[model samples]
Target: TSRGMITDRSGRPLAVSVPVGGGESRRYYPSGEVTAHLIGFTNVDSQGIEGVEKSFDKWLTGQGGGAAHNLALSIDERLQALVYRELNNAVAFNKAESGSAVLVDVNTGEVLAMANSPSYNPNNLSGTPKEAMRNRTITDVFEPGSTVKPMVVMTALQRGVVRENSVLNTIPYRINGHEIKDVARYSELTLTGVLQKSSNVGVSKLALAMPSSALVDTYSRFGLGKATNLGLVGERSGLYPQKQRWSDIERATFSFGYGLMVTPLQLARVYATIGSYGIYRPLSITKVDPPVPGERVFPESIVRTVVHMMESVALPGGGGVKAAIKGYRIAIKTGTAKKVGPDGRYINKYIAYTAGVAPASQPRFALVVVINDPQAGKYYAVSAPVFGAIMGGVLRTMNIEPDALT
Candidate 1:
């Protein structure tokens, strides 16, 4: 039997079995650290252990003799290289514990790129930290924070509980004996403005106004509670409460993006749904020449309105301005979430992240970036620029026409 090879979308071999003589072979990674986390590494026996090496192991090792060909992935190695560089730069510049990013085609559901910071060289695993082995993109889950504000607002709008231009007072107030407030007290904000500023009070008010089950149902429909059908092991399905009844405090917290967990990939899928104007498709781990069909999850007009409302976020003075690129309309959101320590208590540690679609005029890509425990600053400051740089490169490299002309 002959062993198979693993290649990137463009036929570039990422993992290969090299005959090292004596009728034996050794696995080698050609892309090294650039693809270390996603492609994964093998054990001393060259058996599958992590990444695609482990996920597609059965097909990779022919055992005795069978039709052996390459397992081509959905990733674009060139884009993967760009994402990896910017992701690594963000983690190093911000002195963050780690970082992860995911980019997928909106219409096709192909995972064009997935990058992780603190990536180790699979070619030589010596002296590598154990943390480098964790594929944070799929394995780690975090509270979505304000980045989930669009979805919460979308739920409200979907139920006719709120309008696109519905205005809410953003002054500090209390909900169920728990005080809720914004980053800065704005006299009042339109529903669209709520997402632009990412005001905690604004989102909480919109979410809490609905029946308790509304937000949970919306979140479930958006693919939050289930693990995606990606070709990977150890993937976290994320925590979404299924309680029949909810307390005022719990409901309030859920509205503002807490008490529920999601991975970077899941969050990206949500935005990709937006990218398709509400079409929901499973992300493909292998390249799909002709994309699979998707089910319509929302009315195109509703999602279109929400997408426009989100575009204001990248305008000047908005929270996600750093995530914008000139000449291109972008719908983006950034957020920060506090991490819980081993004691199950909220700690000072934080994860700053951003997620959104680009070229909003004709959406094509959905992207997410998460920076964990940044020591330099917080919120959009740490993650937004990374998003911009990587996405800007994507737009330029892919030759996507600019929709928003100056």
Candidate 2:
């Protein structure tokens, strides 16, 4: 009569109370740290409302009277708790309006935890803050910044359009009457080096070489425009507009995660593919009950090259070095993209993000963190540490022993 129990991966009920409203006013919603775009919330009726709750309600509730079924997700509640604690602290201290963290099983595509800040307790959903109900990971879309560079590089590599040793002149280049530049001033870069330094110019150059149609298709293949089918109704399709409508400048912008859109879940899965040797598995917010199969997206050779190149990006003095957790092998990218203005032009304001894979030797988990409108001036310095700290906690809690350092 209590509308059933909501428990953690360990079968521990996160909360328990009599059904005050009989599935009418007291609906189940995400609380504390578990408000991912996937584990959606409910309305006053406690009927399927949003997210996996809505998408998989039929399977969960068995409304057709086939059988009352229970769904077990792939999340580790303990890790989720830790991530939420860290995210709340970071957001509070940094004065960031919102933030989200995702912990994914790199090997199996199991989502260990998906934590978001500015969240509410599912127990208090009937009286929860309206603002807290908004699912940032799904409804929100911001410039991914350099966090998407790996995908751009991977696309090129997988298509054989570029190689690890491929050199890209980083000097300012004009494509389709548009001038593209790197975040920093680098005159020249190799394909590996472009990712090492997150060179927008180099990536733009590569993007220009491909037809807009090809680039658009590649982005879709990476799960940009389509819903992740992660059983979340509120999830946005992560805009990957058709190529025919793209301007040359737009094409160049898309090379580095601009002029395009992606959900936090989509980005997490994309990095998961990179770490898992080009295999893509549908992401799960709940603990894995019926294990989902992973799809092979990239060839082994391409996966090796991309992961290797990304490792260099996380090495000492690399663009992602600051993101390295003390003893963990973290292959990461940081993105700081200019915010778009109301006039539909790019503004100087920036959004910061960090996306990475850990224990790079075999890769076990992938994580992504994004901070929108950081009061701080720069992203790498401000947000990278937050992500690093989160990753450190995740690895330690998961008992993933730190890699031996030289």
Give me the candidate number with maximum lDDT: 1
TM-score of each: 0.96, 0.87
Residue-by-residue lDDT tens digits, candidate 2, 130-226: 6766677777766666776777777787667887787878998777566676567887887888888888788887787777776666656656676
- List the global CA lDDT of all models: 0.85, 0.71
How many Å off is the CA of 270 in candidate 1? 0.9
Give candidate 1's TM-score: 0.96
Task: Give lDDT for model 2.
Answer: 0.71
> So what's the TM-score on candidate 2?
0.87
lDDT for each residue of candidate 1 in 1-406, tens digit (9 for 90 to 100): 2468889888998988888887788888899988888898888785778888888877777565577667899999989999999999889999999999999999998999998888999988999988778889999989998877877877888888888878889888897678787767898988888878888888777777889888787777677887888878788888888788888788888887888889999999989988998898888888787857988877788889989988888898678888889789999988777997768679988888889899989889999999999988655358989888999999988999887877
> How large an RMSD does model 1 have?
1.6
CA deviation > 4 Å runs, candidate 2: 15-69, 125-128, 245-247, 289-292, 341-343, 377-381
